[model samples]
Target: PSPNLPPGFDFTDPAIYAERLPVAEFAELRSAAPIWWNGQDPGKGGGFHDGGFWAITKLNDVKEISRHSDVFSSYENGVIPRFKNDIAREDIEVQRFVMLNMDAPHHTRLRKIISRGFTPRAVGRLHDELQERAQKIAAEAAAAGSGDFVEQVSCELPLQAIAGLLGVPQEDRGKLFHWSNEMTGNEDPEYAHIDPKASSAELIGYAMKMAEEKAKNPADDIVTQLIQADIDGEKLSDDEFGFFVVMLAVAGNETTRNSITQGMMAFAEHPDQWELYKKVRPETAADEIVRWATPVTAFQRTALRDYELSGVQIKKGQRVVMFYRSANFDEEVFQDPFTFNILRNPNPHVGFGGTGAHYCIGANLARMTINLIFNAVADHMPDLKPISAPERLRSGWLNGIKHWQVDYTGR
Candidate 1:
C-alpha cells in the first residue's frame, strides 16, 4: 500500500515470493529503474535491517558488480542486503572463515582448501557414485508413481553428495538433511515457523564436534582435509572450520536441491522441452535448467567507495544486491528469455555467479548432479507428469520448492 511504489510492488514481502515473482514489475524496473532503491518492509525485522538496497536487475550490471570485488566487497558487510538482514549482519563476524563471507587473500586461501575436495578432477572421481545415487533416486520416484518429488528425488542427491564428501556416516545424513532444512526454511512457516538461531547453533555444534573427531581419527574426507589444510602456516581455526562446514551443508544443499526441483517442474510444465532435453547434451541442458531456475535468487554486496553503476549514482557504503533471477530472464542476454529451451547455447547466465573470484565452488558438482538426474528423468520417466502445482518456499533469498507432487507410469 506504499504510494511511492508501483501498483503491487512489494518485493520485500516473503509471501509475494511464495506466489511468484512480479515479472512484469521486474521488467518495468529493468526498463525504467535498473538500480531502483528497495525499501524495507515493516514487520520484516531480523534479516531485513534498516535503510534500503539498490536492486541491480540487468545482466551486465550484475556482472559488473560481481567482478569488481574491491569496489563491491562481500567482506565489507557479508553479502546480506542491509535493508532487512540484521541477523546476517551480526552473524558475519563469526562466519568470517567461510569463503562466502571473506574476500581476497583469505577467500583465495580458504577456497583452495575447499575446492580441492570439490574440484572437477576430484568430483569427477565421484561420477560413478553420483550416477548410482541418481539412478537409485530416479528408481524410487518411478516406483512411487505419485509422491513429493522434492522429498523423494530432488533433495536426496545433493544431501548424499555433500554428506559423502564430508565422510559422515550414511546413517547420519538424515540429521544433516534436517539441519540444512532448518537453516534455509526459515521464511516458510511450513518448515520453520519458529526461531532459526537454534538451528544454526545446532549445526555449528555438530560441525565442531565432527572436526574434533576427524582430527583424532583422520579419514579420506573433506572434513579431514579442512581440518588439516595449512596455508602459509595457517590452518582453519575452530570457529572458521565450523562455519565452513555449515556453509557447505546449508548453501550447497539448498541451491542444488531447489535447482533440481525447479528443473523438474519447468520440464513438466513444458513437455516439449523435456523431449528436447533428452536430445541435447546433459551439460547443455544443465546450463539451461540452472539459468531458468536461478535457485539462489540474489546475492548482496556492499559498496566500498562512491561509484556510478549503469549510469546510476551510488554512494559509498551503500548496499547493492544483484537479482540473479531477473538477470537470468534478461531478454538482452537470453533470446525469448521466458521460454524454457533445453538447448540454449551461448547461455551466459550467472546462475553460479559466473566468472569471478566468488564463483561457487560446487558449480561443477551441481552440474554433474543435475545432468545425471535430468538424464534419468528423460530416459526412464517419460510418462512423468505433475500431480499438482508445487508448494513454493516463502523466501526472497532462495527460489525453493517446498513440495511438488509428481506421477509416472514407468518404473
Candidate 2:
C-alpha cells in the first residue's frame, strides 16, 4: 500500500498506531519482523525514502548496530528513520555541533570534552537540590489540595532541572520548554511553528552565542568546557560548536521532561503501583520509572553496505530506523511488560540503551531528575489524586506531557 512500508508498518498513520501505545507494538513488531525494509512508508508523510535505508527495532539488534557505529556511520545517515527530516533540514544549515551523530575518533574526541561536565561526581551534588525542586513544585499544587499535576508538578520539574545545563538563562527556561514543545506538538498545530528552517537558525544562533561567551569566560558549565575543549589537539570549529550546543540542549531537556511527565502518567493508571508509595518503600522507584517512560522513541541509522540482520539483507547506503519504544517492552526481557512497579532491578529495558562510549553521558543526570521528583512527591504530597484531565503527547516517535493536574494534602 505504501512505498516506504512492506504493505504494513505504516509510520505516519497515527490512527493505525493510535490504539497501540509504545511498548506493546514494538514488542509485537520485534517478535514478528525484527528487521524490516521500507523503501518508503507513506505514514512518514512526504519526502521520505529517496536516499534508501534499513531499520533495526529489536533490543539485541539495535544495541549491535548502535555499538558498531563504525559500519553504521551516524555522520552519513543519522539515527531516525526518515530522510531529510523537516527538523534536520531546517537546522543543519545553521548549526554544526554534531552530538552523537558523528562516528568514532571525532565522536570519541568531542564526547570527551563534554563528558567532564556530566561525570558522576558533578551530577551527584545536584541530587539534594533536585529533590527539593521537585518537592517545592509539587508542594505549591499540593497545598492547594488540587491542581493540574502535569503542568505544575511533572512538566516543570525536569524543565527547570535541565535549563541550567543547557546554559539557558534561568528566566528564559520557559522558551526552551516552548521550543521543544511545538516541534512535536502537532497534536495541537497551534504549538507547532518555527519551520524546520527557522528552528535551525534559532538553535544555531543561540549555540553560537553560548560558544562565544564560553571562549571569553570559561565556567564549570558544559558550554564553558566545550569552549575550552580541544579535540585530538584540535579546537572545536564554529560548526561543531553550533551542532553540539543544540544537541545537548535538546537532549538535556526533552528526554528527561518526558520521563518525568509520562512516568507520572503511567503511575496514575496503575493504582496498585501508586499505593506502594505509602505501603512498600522501593529504593529503586526512579529506575523503575525510567523503564516505564523510555523517553526516546527511535534513533535512525544507515547501513554502509549489504548486510544481513533480523533474517533480512540490507544494501549499502541504506537507512535503518531503530524503534526503542518497542525494544523496552520486548517480551523476551520483561515477563509482564505492562505492569507498573516501584522496585524493578535488572530492568534490561534499554531505557538508556546498551553501555558503550555513547551510553548517554547524561544518563545519571536523567536518573537524578526522576529521583528528585519521586522523592519529593512521596515525602511531601499526601493523598495526591488525579486532579486534571490527561492529554497525550502528539507524536509517533516521541511521548511527552502537556498537562498534569492533581489534588493533594501537604503538611
Candidate 3:
C-alpha cells in the first residue's frame, strides 16, 4: 500500500466506477493529495499497468502534464494503461503508429492531414442534415413512448454522423456500432469473451476494403479526402489510414453517444436544469454537458524523465494518468462543482483534453452533435424522463452507460 494514498483507495478497479463516479473520493484526493500514487493490485487480475502510476486529479496539474507531451510521452507505452503482462510488446509497437499514441513530428503530420477532413467548413456542411436527423430521431423516440434511451435516443445521431463522414453505407452502420462496443467494452462482462484486438483488426480490414473502393471511385467523404490528402508531399500509408479509421470509429462514435446519454440522465435528475434548458436554451449547454459527462474518464502518459508535479516527485518511466472526470469537477476551478448548471461559462473543463497537442480533433463535431440532439429533445420530447436506472459500462477508462430506459409523451 502506498503511504501517501488514502486507505482502500483503488481507482484502477473497474468495479469502483460501475455504479457512479467516486466523486467524494476524488474531491478528497484533490484537496489532500492532488498527485497521489496508485499502487497496482495483483488480486484485481492486473487490468491496469503492473507498475503503479501517479494520478493527477487537479485541473491545472492535468493541463501542465498535457502541455509538455515531450516530458510525458504518450508513445512510450501507448495511451491506454495496460498491465505490462497483459499486452504483448509487438502489439504496443503496432499501436505506436496511431495518432493518439504519437508525438511531435509524427502526430503533427498526421493531424494536419486528418484535420483537412474535419475542418470547421467540412463539419459545418453537415449541420443542417444533422439537425434534421436529430429532429427525426427525437420524433421517433417520442412516438415509441418508452424504450431504452441508449438505443432509441442517444445512439443514432452520432452513429449516423460518423457513418456519413466515413462514407459508410447506411445499412453497414450497425457493424461500426458493434465493433466500437466490443472494442471499448472489454472490461464489461458481456464483452469479456471478445478480444478488442480482434475487433480492431476486423475494423481495419473493413476500412481497407472501403479505401480500395474509394480509390477507384472517389466520393465526397472523409475516406476519399484522406485517400487524396497529403502533408509535405507525403500521403498516409494503408496502415496509417486503417488506424485512422479505427480511431474515428471509436472516438467519433462512442464519446458523443455516451455524452448524449449522460446529458439526458442529468436533465432527467435535475428537472430545474431541464426546465431552464428549455426556457433559455443557453449557448454554453453543449460544453456544460460535455463537462458533466466527461465520457473518456482518464488517459495515461508515461513520464520520459523524473519530474515533480504538485510537490510530488514522479520518476522516469512512471505512468501519470490525468483523470478528466476529477479535473472537470475540481472545486478549485468550478463553483459548486457537484451541481449540474447549464449556464456555467468559462468552464475550462478538459472534457475533450487539456492544453495539449493531442486535444480532440472532433471537438467541434461533438459539440455540434450534442447541441442539435438536445435541442431536438427539448423541442419534441420535453416530457422525456428516465424510467429505469442506468446500467453502467464496467470500465474505468470509459464513462459509458449500457442501458437507460426512458419515457416521453408524444407531442
Candidate 4:
C-alpha cells in the first residue's frame, strides 16, 4: 500500500521536471515519507508502466541503498528508475553489458579494467589539452556575443572530452553528440523522430569499427586501453567494448553538459555567488556546482532479498529508487542546501551516484572539465550572463538544460 503522499504528488511525470524541479514536493516527501511508494498511474501518461516502486528521498537512505549493492541489485533491471513496461526486455538484457547495469565480480572486473583509462595520471595527461580546448570554446562563446549556451558553450567541451577519451576523430565528434542526445532525449518531443534503440545500434556499429581500427593501430586512448586491457586473462569482447563506448558517449556527454549549463544558470540567478566565484575561484566550486545541478536525478535498484529500511519493509524483487537530486538537498546533510554557495566545503552530494560500484567513473574527468571551462569563462568572459531562462529537458531522469541564451563581452 502506498503511503499518504502530497496531493498530486507524481515524480514519474517528466512534464513537472520540465517546468521546474519539484523541490517543494521533494521537501514534503523527505519530511513525511523518505521511503515513499510511488505507484504507477497510466492516467498520468508518463513512463513506468510497471507497478509501484519505493522512492528513497533522504541522503542517509540513499547511501544505505547504494552501499549495499548485494541487497539492492543494479543488475536486477538496470540502473534506470523504470520497469519492464518502459524498457523492453531485450534492451534491458543488452544494457546489462554496460558497467552501470552490472553487479558484483563482473562489475568490479570491468571497472578495474576501465579504471586504467580514467586513472588520475591518465586524466591528468589530457588536462593541458582539455584546458586549451576549454579556452578556445570560451573564446568562441565570447566572440558570438550571444547565443544558445547549450549548443555553443556548455556542450562542446564534454563532447570533445568524450571523443578524445574514445579516440573518436574530431570530424565525427558531432555524431557522438547527436547519438548521445538521441539516446538521452528519449522523453523529449524534440527527439521523438529519432529512435533511441536505432541510435544505440548505430553507436554500437560505429564503436565496433573503431575497436577493429584500434586493434590494428592502437592509440593512447580509452578505446585502445579497453581493446588491450584484461582481467584474469579474460578480455572484453568487441561488442562489450562497443557498449562501453556507447555508455561513455551518453554518460560522459550529457551529465557534464547539463552540469556546466546548469551551473552557469545558477550563477546567472545568484549574481552574488557569481561575483564571489569570479573573485575567489574557490576549490570547492565544481562540487558545489554538481551538488546544485545534480545532473542525473535518480537511479533504481531492485531488492535481492527482503529488507527493512527506515521502518519500511521492502520485499524481495521490489524496486527502490534513490533520488540524488533530493538527497543532495537533504537539510540534515547540507547546510542551507537551497543556496548556491561556491565555498560549500565538505559537500557530500551524490550528484555522482551514492557510494557504490555504480558511482560514476567519469567523475574525475567531469570535475576537471567543469573546473577548466569555468576558469576559462572567468578569464575570458567575466561579464558573461544569461540572457534568457533555460529550456530544460522534459525528462524525469536527467536535469538537463536544452538551451539558454547567454551574452558576454569578449576580452
lDDT of each: 0.77, 0.63, 0.83, 0.83
lDDT of 4 by residue, 1-411 (tens): 434455656675688777898888788888877888787666342334457688899999999999999899988778886422355567766678789999988998888878877878778878888999999998898888888988888888988888777777889988888888777766777766867778889999998988888889978886667768455665567888888878887788888999998898888889999899889888689999999999988888899999999899999988888899899999999999999988988889999989877788888899999999999888889987777788988886788888887878722
Model 1 per-residue lDDT tens digits across residues 323-357: 88888899888799999887778889999984688
TM-score of each: 0.91, 0.84, 0.93, 0.94
User: In model 4, where do residues sit more than 4 Å from their true spots?
Assistant: 1-8, 42-50, 83-87, 229-231
Candidate no. 4 TM-score = 0.94
> Where is the poorest 10-residue window by lDDT in model 1?
1-10
- When 2 and 3 are scored with lDDT, the better candidate is 3
Distance (Å) between predicted and true CA of 388, model 3? Answer: 2.1
lDDT of 3: 0.83
TM-score of 1: 0.91
Candidate 1 vs 2: which has more TM-score: 1
lDDT of 3 at 77: 74
Single out the weakest 10-residue window by summed lDDT for candidate 3.
42-51
Q: Where is model 2 more than 4 Å wrong at Cα?
A: 1-7, 12-24, 38-46, 51-55, 82-96, 166-169, 172-190, 194-200, 229-239, 278-283, 387-389, 409-411
For all candidates, what are the clash counts?
A: 7, 33, 0, 0
Candidate 2 lDDT tens digits, 331-391? 6777776678777776777778655556777777888787777667767674566666656
Over 4 Å off, model 3: 1-6, 43-50, 82-89, 229-231
